[PDB]
Every structure is written in structure tokens, then in C-alpha cells.
Amino acid sequence: SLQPPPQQLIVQNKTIDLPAVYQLNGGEEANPHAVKVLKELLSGKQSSKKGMLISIGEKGDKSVRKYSRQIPDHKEGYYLSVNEKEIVLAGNDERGTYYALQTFAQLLKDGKLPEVEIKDYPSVRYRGVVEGFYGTPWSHQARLSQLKFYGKNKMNTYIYGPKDDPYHSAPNWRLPYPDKEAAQLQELVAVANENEVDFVWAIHPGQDIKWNKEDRDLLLAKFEKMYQLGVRSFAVFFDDISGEGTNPQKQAELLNYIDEKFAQVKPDINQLVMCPTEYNKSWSNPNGNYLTTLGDKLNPSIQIMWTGDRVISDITRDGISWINERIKRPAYIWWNFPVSDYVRDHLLLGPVYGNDTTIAKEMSGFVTNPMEHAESSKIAIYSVASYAWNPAKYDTWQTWKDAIRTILPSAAEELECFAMHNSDLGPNGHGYRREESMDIQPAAERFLKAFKEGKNYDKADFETLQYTFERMKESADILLMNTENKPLIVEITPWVHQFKLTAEMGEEVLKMVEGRNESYFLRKYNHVKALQQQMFYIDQTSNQNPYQPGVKTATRVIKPLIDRTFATVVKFFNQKFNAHLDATTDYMPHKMISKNLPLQVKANRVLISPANEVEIELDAIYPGENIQINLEISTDGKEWKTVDLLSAGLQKAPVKFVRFQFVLTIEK
Ligand SMILES: CCCCNC1=N[C@@H]2[C@@H](O)[C@H](O)[C@@H](CO)O[C@@H]2S1
């Protein structure tokens, strides 16, 4: 499965052996990065004057003058041919030759090659990744791995813009990088060049920029330093800011000044990109004129980025038509998937879909904003690379499977199982959701409806659920020990542990359904409760970021199935035996009475779940920080003390009981 799929392909039912003796034509004049890849593939074979001909070079070179009319006349295009007599690897330009060898490398299976003719080129000019998220920036080693991945998948753009890099954003965008960071960026630029990737260094000055000479000069001086480090593409971001920095005329004047005094003055600057303040249709104000001002004033060679109809959205024909008409040029898409920085307790490992496949001519570029988990993001990155190169032939599911098999060939089926059930975002303020667990959701829905109603569930549905949990356990345990992509496994391990616990819980709940005698049922009930406690422990000790701490997995279909099945069968047990087993589905060490709203623990906070439509007792005495609501305290539940106020400080007073958003913060 060639990825990305080439524009034009003709295969014959004949196989050629990678010649033991070959004659290289054009190795001295072709793209060195391409030649280097080719010599690596021919490492065990000898190069004599006889033997199979191998012609590599760019259009205009002597080596490929024969095939000049076969080479597509598109940037980054190439012509590739293999037959029993000769191999041709001919780019329309140097990057095309490199892309011919990236395809050539996929065709080489077991030392054999298919007899094939290929004419290929990208439908979208700029394709790649923007490290543009909030959270821990990708490590240096992660970024190096990313750049080699991009070259392999014909992504030619990497836009560096981590929101939390202090030399990228306010206020220290004015300061040059220290020497250590600068040397790293220098290495990144070189590795990008060797993999045929434009390294675009972005700056995010909007929150405190002054529209004066001083800050203009500092931004240009910063761009000059980055240029001395090797950077040849630049971006200015005005996203997620307030104040004077949002002025579209001033933004356009600044970008045009950079364009005329820097971008066009250097000999060798490629991309110049900006992000507007109103960067999706819903944030555009029809009472004003922001987008048409940038469209008219900004020099036309400058790119303008866009996320679609909403902050998080997929690109439609009507949507891109809407923006293009206003910015007077094809939008450069910033696609906010798989970025998870607003649902940080979820991994987003599902397929890439939703974007119209017929609108390649309507966009200048297409980049994905990924997760702070770099390796995990390669599933979506690989798929975007395929979509962007050949959208007409974009195959969502086959590309997702191909990505997984490329990233983790030693355990591809196990990663597919995990990713299949780790793709929805859960409820969130952007309203963006993805499908998850589609394969088993019909059997889960049938089983639960029947069980709740007292009707016989279908045996096949019960067995599908049993199979699912068994496979999840297998997949979790195999993934934990996989050593082929250790950085990937480091990233996902907390979710893999939670995933296994979910599967164990689901198995034990199904045995309660199979429930044969009272003592067996009780053992399973006690086991389930302990597993709930273990999932709480992981949720409280892993991924403790300040915004969405913890680890959630299989949230769309499976955890609701298990929670609801457990609650139902415990109700049935209590009815049958006149018992009073607790049917709560998530462990909570603290207690609340009055509401069935569950309490939640997040970091050092104890909170009542908000709802759409009271006494808290903690498991110990803690020093109190504050209580926030949108009021009495005690340590023994007998002697109380009132607190005035919504908000109220506790001043480290001992707290075990509270009585009256509803959140208590305590010291730890
Ligand atoms: C139009 C291109 C700029 C879009 N910029 C965005 N900035 C924020 C990003 O840093 C976040 O990662 C993204 C997802 O939360 O939301 C918005 S989208």
C-alpha cells in the first residue's frame, strides 16, 4: 500500500530483482538527499559499468533527458519507472527526485520490485504539521523523529510554534534563544533540510506588541537571528490574544514590512505565513471588517491560516469558499486534530476524516495541529500526509491501518485495538467529537437494552463483548512490553494501564451477569469495586496536568456499557436477595449526602459534579485552602464554624466536613 497513493499508477504482473550489478546514471548531479537514500538501498550490491541502468536526476539533467515528457510539470512532481532493463527516478525538481525515492523505497519488498510506471505530484502545495498546541512542547528527540517521518511521507512543512515556548510568545519573543536551545534549533533546521522539509519558525507577539518602531525592530532582529541559525521560512501568529495586537491594519502593515524589508531582501526565503485573530468563521464578527481588511491589505504572496467554521472543525467546500472570498487567496488550513490540549485526559488515536476531498485547489496548504504526545500523533500525521498529497484517493480506514502498521509493525493489531477504543474526545466546550468503538457499539446497545428491560439478550452480542474485553487485555499487556517504539509506549502507558483495568472490569461485570450463585456474584462484586479503586489511583497519579488531569479511556461506548450493566445487575441482586449492595460505578474516598451527583477529585480539589437542572465528608482532616461556589466547616461533624463569603478563604484551618460549581481546595 503506497502512501501517499500516487496520482497515476500502472502495475504489471512481473517482478524485478534489485540488481546485484547496476550502473548509476546521474548520481553526481541529482539531489544529494535523494542519492543518499538510493545508495543506502543498494548497500549490499556492487556498482560496475555493466549491469542494470539506474537513471536519477532532475528535469533538465543529462541523466533523465529521455523521459522529460513523462515527468509531470508540477512542483515536487516525479516520474518513476521499473522494468527488466532500467530504473528511472526523475523529479521535476530536487524535492521531486527525493519523493520518487520515498516511493521507490516502499516498492522494494524482499529485494524484489514490481514492474511499474508512476506519474505523481501533490494536489496541495504545502502539507505538514504545526507544533502549535498548549502544553509541554515536543522534546528535541521527538522533533528529530518527526522530521524524518515527514520526509518519508512527503510532508514538506513543519511550523514551529509551541504556545508555551517562552521565546516564541510573550514577553520573551523579543529575546534570542539561549545558546543551548539555539544549537538545537540549528540541528533541527539541518535535519529538516536533509528530509526536504521547510522549517517555518513562528513568532507570537500579539498579546503585548506595541505598534511602534521599537517592537517592530525587535521582531525583525529576532527573525534575523533565526535566519543566522538556518531558518528560511517565517510566520507571525495573532491567535488567542486581546488588545491592540488584534488590529488588522497594523497586522497587515507589519507583515508587509517584514515581506518587503526582510523576506524579499534575503535571497532564499520561502514561506511567509500569518494567523489572524479571527481565525474561524464563528469568531469572525460580521459587525466589523477584520478579514476583508487583511485580505485587501496583506501582500498576496503571504499565507493566511484558517481552522474552518469553528476553532475545532473539519474543512468543507462551503466553508473554504466562505473564507477564500474574504482573504482574496486560498486559505492555508490549520486543522485542529489530533490536538488534545483541551481534553488532556484523552488520547485521540482514531482515523482522520471529515475534510472534503475535492477542494485541493481551494487551499494553499494543509497542516495538522497534533497532540503534545509526538509519537502517538503519527497516526493522524501519516493520514493527513496521505490526504494532502492525494485527496481524491484518500481512504480513511486503510490509511489509519497503514499508519499503525508503519509505526508499530511488531504489534500492529494490538495498537489498532487500543486506538479503536481511544479516539473520542468526550464532552468539551468546542463541541467536537469523534466516533469510537463503532465495531461493537451495536452489540453493546442491543445487550444493554435487553438486559435492562428483562428480555433475553442475544448470545452473539454477549460473546462479542466477551471477545472485546479479552482482546483489550491482550493488547494492553503486549503494548506495555513492546520495545520497537519505546517513546510511543512511554507516551501511552498510563492509558494502557487504564485500558487493561477497563477490560478486566468489563469481564468481571459480565460474569456477574452470568451470575450463577450468590457467593460467586459477591466475589465478582468485590473484585469490581477494587478495580474501580485502582482506576481512581491511576486517574490521580498519572498525567496530573493543571487542566484535565488523569487518564480516561474507552469513554464513548465501553465505560458507559460497563457502568450501566454493573448498576443494573446490582439492582437485580438487591431486589432478588433483599440486599443493599452499593451500585456506584466510580470509586470516591470522600462522601456527600443531601443528590446523586458524584463527587470528583482533581489534584487537591474535591468538587460536586456540575449538572444541568448538602454535606461533604472527607476521608481525613486536611488543611483547607478555599471554597468556591457558583457555609460551615468542621473536623468532627459536631463542632462547626461558619465561613463568610462566590469564594471564601480557609487559611489552612483543619477541615473534614463542609456544609452549605462547588469546590473545596485542600493542602497536599
Ligand atoms: C488560524 C491558525 C491559528 C489557529 N490557532 C489556534 N490557536 C489555539 C491552539 O493553540 C490550540 O492548540 C487549539 C486547540 O485548543 O485552539 C486554538 S487554534
Residue numbers in the entry: 4 to 597, 603 to 621, 631 to 647, 659 to 673, 680 to 694, 708 to 715
What's the paper's own text on this?
The enzyme responsible for removing O-GlcNAc from proteins is O-GlcNAcase (OGA),23 which is a member of glycoside hydrolase family 84 (GH84) of the CAZy classification system. Inhibitors of O-GlcNAc hydrolase (OGA), the enzyme that removes O-GlcNAc from proteins, lead to increased O-GlcNAc levels in cells and are seeing widespread adoption in the field as a research tool used in cells and in vivo. Structures of bacterial OGA homologues, in which the active site residues are completely conserved with hOGA,34,35 show a discretely sized pocket having a volume that nicely accommodates the propyl substituent of 15d. Structural data of inhibitors in complex with an hOGA homologue reveals the basis for variation in binding among these compounds.
A butyl chain, however, leads to a greater than 100-fold loss of potency (15e, Ki = 350 nM). To assess the structural basis for this stepped decrease in potency observed on going to the 2′-aminobutylthiazoline 15e, we determined the structure of Bacteroides thetaiotaomicron, a bacterial homolog (BtGH84) of hOGA, in complex with the parent 2′-aminothiazoline 11a, the tighter binding 2′-aminopropylenethiazoline 11b, and the butyl derivative 15e, which shows greatly diminished binding. In all three structures, the respective inhibitor binds in the active site in a conserved mode with an invariant hydrogen bond pattern for the aminothiazoline moiety. Even a small further extension of the alkyl chain, as in the butyl derivative 15e, leads to steric clashes with multiple residues in the cavity, driving the side chain of C278 to adopt a different orientation. Furthermore, we observe the polypeptide main chain surrounding C278 is shifted away from the inhibitor. Thus, the size of the pocket disfavors substituents longer than three carbon units in chain length, and those inhibitors having such larger groups induce unfavorable conformational changes within the active site. We also noted that the selectivity ratio for hOGA increases as the 2′-aminoalkyl chain length increases to the three-carbon propyl (15d) and propylene (11b) derivatives, but this trend reverses once the chain length increases further, as seen for the 2′-aminobutyl analogue (15e). Since the active site pocket for hHexB is more constrained in the vicinity of the acetamido group, these observations are consistent with structural observations of both bacterial hOGA homologues and hHexB. This suggests that once the 2′-substituent passes the volume that can be accommodated in the active site of hOGA, increases in bulk are even slightly more deleterious for hOGA as compared to hHexB.
